[PDB]
Amino acid sequence: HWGYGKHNGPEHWHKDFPIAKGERQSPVDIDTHTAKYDPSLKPLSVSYDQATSLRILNNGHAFNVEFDDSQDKAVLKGGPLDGTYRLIQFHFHWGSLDGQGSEHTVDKKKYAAELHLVHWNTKYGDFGKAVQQPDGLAVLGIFLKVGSAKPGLQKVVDVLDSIKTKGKSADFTNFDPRGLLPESLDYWTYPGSLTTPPLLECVTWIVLKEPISVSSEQVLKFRKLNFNGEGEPEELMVDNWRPAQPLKNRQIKASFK
Ligand SMILES: NS(=O)(=O)c1nc2ccccc2[nH]1
C-alpha cells in the first residue's frame, strides 16, 4: 500500500490514514533555542543488560531487529515516563546520500540516519493495545552522522546481505543494543506519533542530543537493501524517512541546560 516513492510516499498517506494531518504527528523539527530546559525531568533509565534479540526482518520499509518482549528483559523507564516500557524492536531511517535520512531534525539540520528503539507500556499488556493509548509507546531516537565506524553496529550491517528483499528474515540472537548508544543520555522529549502508518498518536518521543558516528561503509550497506520482494525490479531501500510535521500545540522539553 504505502511506501516512500512519489506515488505512495508521505504526501499520500493521509488518504488511507487521515490521522496523518492530526494534532500530534511526528517527526518534528527540534528548535534548540525554543525547547525549554525542564529541571523536573529525570535521567533516563535504559536497562538493556538482559535484552534478548531474536530475529532481523526486512519488512519492505526498513529492517527491524526484534526482541523477546514476553517479559521485562530490556526496559526504558524514568526521563518523562511513568511506568515501564519494554523494548520490542529497533530500526533505522536513512537517506540516499549523507545530507538527509533522519526524521527528526535539529534547527533544520538533517542527519544521515536515525535509529528508533521502540518500547511499549507494560500497563497495557501487549503492543497492539498500547498503540491505542496516548501514553502507550516510548520511542528512543538516536541520530547517526557519518565519520568513524560504530563497532556495535557492525553485526547488523554484516547480516543485511541475507535479508536483501521484502519479507526476508534471519536469526539475530545475542545482539547487544547497548553498543548503539552514545555516551550522553541528555535528551529532548515531546508527545507525538508513529512515523509510519498507522501513524497512531501514542508515542512519548525521547530524542538523544548526542549522535552516534557510523562509517560511510556502514551506511552504504544500508543503502544496498531493497524495498522490493525477491526477483522483483530492484528499488533500493533509501530515503525511508518521513519529513518534519507541524509542531502545533506542543512543547519540546530538554533534559539538559
Ligand atoms: N518509526 S516509529 O515511529 O518508531 C514506528 N514504530 C512502529 C512500530 C509499528 C508500526 C509503525 C511504527 N512506526
Ligand SMILES: [Zn+2]
Ligand atoms: Zn522509525
